[PDB]
């Protein structure tokens, strides 16, 4: 059974670069490579069939080549809505096996993240739980610490954190974290600070709030 | 104009059997080669097997030739994948793909249908409005959220206005917790949009038949 070995996994390259993914097969596959993009969100597409042929609509900045057991696929000028998983095949053979694919993120310039805070909702109290939820929307580089802090004090058990891909339309990455308390534990305590520290900025950014008020 | 629909999918126990079907429409679906593939959470891509327009010829990955059969009717445009004594190495993503003309390259991909392996029970989500702070100031933009929390298993669907709300919109990967599934959305609005003109979030989880509206007001009395 034939492995496809994929390089490199991850690429963070600037708009208007030249990008070059590699695919090594563990055995000959003669010229019966395909390169496949899947966007975030979305299912994939065929870019590149038989090493090195565009796929109808696929645009120009769109190349492969290669034989035997080396093949490559080509970006001549990356563009932001180029952002996509890339993953190539061979189908010489029964199984018709994929690489494991290459992450591709875009540069763009710094970006501070726009911060909201949200007190648990009027509808959640009852059931006797309680979700402090933080939004940290449109911000670049993508890495980013959250702290949370109850009067005063960082707390960190019950602390879920998600990640949005980086989005095409703006270049940017947000995040969602989420303080789970019971009822009780909200209740004996005022004050609740959502805290993000980003290279943008010297200083934490913080949105914070008063349980009565 | 091309087009698949994969179906099917939900929840399965372990050691189960499942039919996934896949309905083609925009071509002639008694030409064409048809395949199977899947992607697990977090990882590549992986073939699972294909099948002529005649039926006459059908292959596999050798780690499903004998738990997975793959099958068609050209009468009802159709391919199916029966699924047998099902791990939770086969929970994934299932897609269906059409072989373009002449290469056994997949030319076009379904959405998909979503297939969980386990022992653990289906669950409706919450579904709880996000309003901002109480002591609103004037800034020019406002935030809005809105929290599935857990259900089981995935997926949920998420819009805002029943998709007429779609730009300023972030929905998060969900985030697994003991057998349960939590996720949220943020949707930013102009001020002068909201509280003025309403807005609801709407949320599906078909694995409960959940169909659930909150509509988004500023917190304080009624
Ligand atoms: C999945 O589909 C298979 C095939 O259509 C079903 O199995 C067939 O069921 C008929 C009853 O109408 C039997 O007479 C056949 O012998 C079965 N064929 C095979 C190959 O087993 C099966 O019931 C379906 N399973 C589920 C869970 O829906």
């Known amino acids: 059974s034939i492995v496809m070995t994929q390089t490199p996994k991850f690429l963070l390259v600037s708009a208007g670069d030249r990008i070059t993914i590699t695919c090594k097969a563990s055995?000959?596959?003669?010229?019966?490579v395909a390169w496949y993009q899947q966007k975030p969100g979305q299912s994939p597409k065929l870019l590149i069939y038989?090493?090195?042929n565009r796929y109808t609509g696929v645009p120009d900045r769109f190349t492969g080549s290669g034989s035997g057991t080396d093949f490559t696929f080509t970006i001549s000028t990356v563009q932001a809505e180029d952002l996509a998983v890339y993953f190539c095949?061979?189908?010489?053979?029964?199984?018709?096996?994929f690489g494991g694919g290459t992450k591709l993120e875009i540069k763009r310039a710094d970006a501070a993240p726009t911060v909201s805070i949200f007190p648990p909702s009027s509808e959640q109290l009852t059931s006797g739980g309680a979700s402090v939820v933080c939004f940290l929307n449109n911000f670049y580089p993508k890495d980013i610490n959250v702290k949370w802090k109850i009067d005063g004090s960082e707390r960190q058990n019950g602390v879920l954190n998600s990640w949005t891909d980086q989005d095409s339309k703006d270049s940017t990455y947000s995040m969602s974290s989420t303080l789970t308390l019971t009822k009780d534990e909200y209740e004996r305590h005022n004050s609740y600070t959502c805290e993000a520290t980003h290279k943008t900025s010297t200083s934490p950014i913080v949105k914070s709030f008063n349980r009565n008020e | 104009n091309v087009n698949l629909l994969e179906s099917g999918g939900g929840l399965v126990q372990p050691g189960g059997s499942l039919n996934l079907s896949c309905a083609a429409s925009?071509?002639?679906?008694?030409?064409?080669?048809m395949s199977w593939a899947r992607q697990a959470p977090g990882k590549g891509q992986e073939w699972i097997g294909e099948?002529?327009?005649?039926?006459?010829?059908?292959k596999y990955t050798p780690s499903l030739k004998d738990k997975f059969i793959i099958s068609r009717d050209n009468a009802k445009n159709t391919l199916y994948l029966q699924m047998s004594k099902v791990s939770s190495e086969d929970t994934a993503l299932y897609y269906c793909?059409?072989?373009?003309?002449?290469?056994?390259?997949?030319?076009?991909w379904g959405p998909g249908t979503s297939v969980t392996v386990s022992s653990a029970k289906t669950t409706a989500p919450s579904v709880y409005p996000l309003a901002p702070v109480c002591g609103d100031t004037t800034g020019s933009s406002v935030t809005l959220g809105c929290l599935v929390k857990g259900y089981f298993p995935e997926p949920v669907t998420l819009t805002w206005n029943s998709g007429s709300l779609s730009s300023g919109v972030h929905t998060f990967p969900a985030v697994l917790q003991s057998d349960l599934y939590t996720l949220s959305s943020s949707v930013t609005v102009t001020s002068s949009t909201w509280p003025s003109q309403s807005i609801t979030c709407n949320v599906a989880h078909p694995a409960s038949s959940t169909k659930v509206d909150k509509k988004i007001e500023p917190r304080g009395p009624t």
């Open positions: 099948i002529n327009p005649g039926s006459s010829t059908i």
């Open positions: 925009g071509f002639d679906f008694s030409r064409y080669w």
């Open positions: 055995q000959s596959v003669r010229n019966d």
């Open positions: 793909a059409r072989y373009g003309s002449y290469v056994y390259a997949m030319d076009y």
């Open positions: 038989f090493a090195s």
């Open positions: 095949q061979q189908g010489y053979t029964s199984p018709r096996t």
